[PDB]
A paper describes a structure:
In kinetoplastids, three DOT1-like methyltransferases have been identified, two of which (T. brucei DOT1A and DOT1B) have demonstrated methyltransferase activity toward H3K76 (corresponding to H3K79 in human and yeast) in vivo and in vitro. Both DOT1A and DOT1B represent minimal enzymes with less than 300 residues, comprised of a significantly diverged N-terminal domain (magenta in Fig. 1a, b) and a conserved C-terminal methyltransferase core domain (dark blue) that contains canonical and non-canonical methyltransferase motifs. Based on structural and biochemical analyses of DOT1A, we identify key residues in the methyltransferase motifs VI and X for efficient ubiquitin-independent H3K76 methylation in kinetoplastids. Substitution of a basic to an acidic residue within motif VI (Gx6K) is essential to stabilize the DOT1A enzyme-substrate complex, while substitution of the motif X sequence VYGE by CAKS renders a rigid active-site loop flexible, implying a distinct mechanism of substrate recognition.
The asymmetric units of the C2221 and P212121 space groups contain one and two DOT1A enzymes referred to as Molecules I to III, respectively. Hence, we will describe the structure of Molecule I in the C2221 space group and only discuss significant discrepancies among the three molecules. The β-hairpin structure is tightly associated with the methyltransferase core domain through a hydrogen bond network by extending the antiparallel β-sheet of the methyltransferase core domain.
Author numbering: 45 to 93, 110 to 295
Write the structure that this text describes.
Amino acid sequence: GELGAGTPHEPYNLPLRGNPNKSGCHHCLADQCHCVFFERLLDATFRRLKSLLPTFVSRMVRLMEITSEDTFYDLGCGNGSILFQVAFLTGARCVGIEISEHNAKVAKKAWEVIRPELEGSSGRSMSEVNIITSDMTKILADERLFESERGKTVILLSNLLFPKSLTHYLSERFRRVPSGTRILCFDDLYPHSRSVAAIRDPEAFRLFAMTDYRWQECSVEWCTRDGPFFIHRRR
Ligand SMILES: Nc1ncnc2c1ncn2[C@@H]1O[C@H](CSCC[C@H](N)C(=O)O)[C@@H](O)[C@H]1O
Ligand SMILES: [Ca+2]
Ligand SMILES: [Cl-]
Ligand SMILES: [Zn+2]
């Protein structure tokens, strides 16, 4: 149902439906979804105690082919909302890395209060969610990270406000993750808008299949309008 072709000139884009689906959602292709449920649950949880909204996560789970056999990594997970939604929708093991100690504390406490509610409503046990309080560069400096997962690895990199040096280091490091790994970024790790890119960086194209996307309107906190993001799949 997505429009476009995933190319730089025709990125994949999903227009909002004029009327909500049966779950009240204007975003998802499916006529049933959990976006509003998670909106309300997240808001209630964090009241009891720069972001991607639940509609974005619902679209992402489909785009990145996330399965219960995958391990989902949110690099810069913040309060952990993405981890909670991905675990609920996929059953994958979820790992978040957060450099801010306060944010890691908030994510762990929110997970503790939220997991009982998800398991009570769905009747199913939640997969594991782990929060690592650290700079992601320290963690990813280990070449053995992700290797045992055999490419059953999904990585979210919300790096619009990351310094360019950090994104560049991640672009270098992700060339060496196993085949099959899927990586989502916003400030492109492997700029490929121009046709000469494959001559400038032939290794990046040998190592990745690259797909361009527009995020749906009102799916990101900072913008009501749409914007670009990219999925790179290790060949
Ligand atoms: N070098 C670094 N290592 C780990 N986390 C970092 C980091 N630089 C920035 N971050 C974190 O990345 C987060 C970006 S906000 C994105 C939050 C979440 N991924 C979402 O999509 O909703 C911030 O919480 C910030 O603390
Ligand atoms: Ca490797
Ligand atoms: Cl490898
Ligand atoms: Zn939805």
